[PDB]
Amino acid sequence: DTKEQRILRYVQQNAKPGDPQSVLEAIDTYCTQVGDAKGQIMDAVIREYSPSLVLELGAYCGYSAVRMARLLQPGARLLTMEMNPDYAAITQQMLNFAGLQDKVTILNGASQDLIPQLKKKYDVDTLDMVFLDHWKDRYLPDTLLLEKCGLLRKGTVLLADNVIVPGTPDFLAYVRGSSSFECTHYSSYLEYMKVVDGLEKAIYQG
Ligand SMILES: C[S@@+](CC[C@H](N)C(=O)[O-])C[C@H]1O[C@@H](n2cnc3c(N)ncnc32)[C@H](O)[C@@H]1O
Ligand SMILES: [Mg+2]
């Protein structure tokens, strides 16, 4: 019936439960018919930095939540902000089925609204990594807002998808220009448009 509802029907009919990999390729076999390419990059970041506390901005149907949760340590948590409650619902389901729901808490609303609440309401000290994948013209404002709430320590890794195609030249000008962020660029490729795109790692310095 709709794109998101039947991604979930597909996953649930074709994937193996508690098998996150299968859940992942269920979504990016269905969708071929941040995929598995921009995926290597995510996997490498998690693998290198082993963050205890990850904030994802934008869970669509659950792909990058599953992707990252998969590789998190027993103790760790992923907070995922999704402003759309129907995607929140689908992300939820996707996680349960992947058996990763113990590691992920789905935060439900606008990023600009939930971020200020992170310390007092969800008991955060500082974030170990932030995956930015929501509204393109929020990357910079939310980065600044994260900084203001002192949600970033030195070493917090930020990872911004779609950086590149379409958007985010301001974000890039700021983090590469600011000396409170050490930046690295990673290239990625978009399937039907045949375009080089990219992600940006920006490691907070203070
Ligand atoms: C491109 S999708 C996320 C893709 C996802 N990271 C993945 O890998 O599957 C963008 C998502 O962020 C949500 N979104 C956009 N702006 C937002 C905001 N300011 N706060 C929270 N969610 C937002 C949209 O509803 C949408 O689900
Ligand atoms: Mg993306």
Curated annotation (Swiss-Prot):
Broad EC category: transferase
UniProt record, GO biological process: artery development; behavioral fear response; catecholamine catabolic process; catecholamine metabolic process; cellular response to cocaine; cellular response to phosphate starvation; cerebellar cortex morphogenesis; cholesterol efflux
Binding site for Mg(2+): 133, 161-162
Positions on the Extracellular side per record topology: 1-206
Catalytic activity: a catechol + S-adenosyl-L-methionine = a guaiacol + S-adenosyl-L-homocysteine + H(+); 2-hydroxyestrone + S-adenosyl-L-methionine = 2-hydroxy-3-methoxy-estrone + S-adenosyl-L-homocysteine + H(+); 4-hydroxyestrone + S-adenosyl-L-methionine = 4-methoxyestrone + S-adenosyl-L-homocysteine + H(+); 2-hydroxyestrone + S-adenosyl-L-methionine = 2-methoxyestrone + S-adenosyl-L-homocysteine + H(+)
E.C. designation(s): 2.1.1.6
Gene Ontology MF annotations: catechol O-methyltransferase activity; magnesium ion binding
Binding annotation for substrate: 136, 162, 191
Protein name per the record: Catechol O-methyltransferase
Organism: Rattus norvegicus (Rat)
Lineage, top ranks: Eukaryota, Metazoa, Chordata, Craniata, Vertebrata
Residues shown, of full length: 46 to 257 of 264
